[model samples]
Target: ATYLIGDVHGCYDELIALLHKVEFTPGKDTLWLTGDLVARGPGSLDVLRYVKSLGDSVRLVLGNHDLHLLAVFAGISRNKPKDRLTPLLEAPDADELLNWLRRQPLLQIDEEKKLVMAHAGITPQWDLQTAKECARDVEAVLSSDSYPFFLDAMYGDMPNNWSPELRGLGRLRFITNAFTRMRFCFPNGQLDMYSKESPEEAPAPLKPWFAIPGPVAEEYSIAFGHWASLEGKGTPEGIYALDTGCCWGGTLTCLRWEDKQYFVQPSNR
Candidate 1:
């Protein structure tokens, strides 16, 4: 069976414990992650090593924190003392580990299961097909020889809206922000990148991305993380929110695709 896990945020022990609880069999079962694999915890380096050790059995999308790591690697951003990422940065295998991390996609789709996963959430502006195309756009830049250039252009909340005609760094920034940092948004799918509050706390005219009117609401199952305050609640539809704030003293959460069963490891924080 395939397992979808939430934002890890460097909670390596909780990750291991949850996997053990699920009776994970390396080659026999598949693991999917919602990203934010590093930062805010004491085990970012260990988490990176263990996840990469799993190889192809694991699939993960790039969360905002994940991108921040890449930004720091490319010398576009500096490491913060509180981030606890210096160990990861200083590791001998930092280059190799980061190479693997950067190669991961911003979005993942399971055609057979009719399921889609991203670190944050997909914008309502695009349907599944369009979402895939936009994902590939940023992905191509990330996986290319000019990846650092894209990283350099990736930081900001400008161009708060999406348009078919968006081009260059503007287009790339929108796509990246939508897939990695988005949470609350306007009904028309314009992102409200600054508000980190939960849906209950968000003012009127600002709703969770999935709650806004969209084709993705009824047509497909969406899984995402990044909003730990939601506490694993997605929307009234099949959307699933998986981040349970493991790095901030909450449990590590996972969902079994075959049965929609959830497995959680109480946080040791």
Candidate 2:
């Protein structure tokens, strides 16, 4: 049995608490993370060190925040002067940590349990095979010599709706947005990047990715996080959201995939 966790967001202490609450054993259980492991709180370095220490037992799918931290350190991007990430950016492990993070996959498929995990949601427009290909497209750039160019090209909302006609950075941006930062979108799947409020307040045109009906790969039994404000709630059933917004005073969440069960622990931060 294994447990999947949501965005740590620098809440290493909370993560520890949640792990203990779940009675996680490094050997018998695997730990999966939905990324966003840095920024917005204290202990980013500690979290990085601790999680990395877990070795083969831990698997993380990088989120936008994780990418941004790498971008910040590589001089392709810069951290907000007033943001809490300054300490992390200045840490001795910053380079190694971000490099390790950059190499992490953005998407994963656990065929053993028929589970799919991503830092953000991917729609029914693509099957797991297509999704894997799409993820590889960006992962290639992230893992290449000109990764910064690709990272620099990131951070925009144009071409918000996917179209085959989109090309170059446009297509890459769309793919990155869909797989990393997106939460709510139009029922027709048009990206709505501004509405991060709550699911209930989401416009009529906007719907959760899992709510869409089309060619969804529901049998995959996916686990994901990111949309911390949803606080541990995703589309339910086939898809489970493990992020309980621990960085924002909400409890951190963990779900045991093999048993289809969950455990939670309150955050001290």
TM-scores for all candidates: the values are 0.97, 0.94
* Model 1 quality (TM-score): 0.97
lDDT of 1 by residue, 36-154 (tens): 99999889999999999998899889999999999899898988888899999999999999988998999888889988899987888878787889988888888887888899999
lDDT values for all models: 0.89, 0.80
lDDT computed for candidate 1: 0.89
In model 1, the Cα lDDT at residue 168 comes to: 83
Error of 1 at 139 (Å): 1.2
RMSD of each: 1.1, 1.7
**In angstroms, how far off is 232's CA in candidate 1?**
1.2
Name the regions of candidate 1 deviating beyond 4 angstroms.
none
User: For model 1, which pairs clash?
Assistant: none
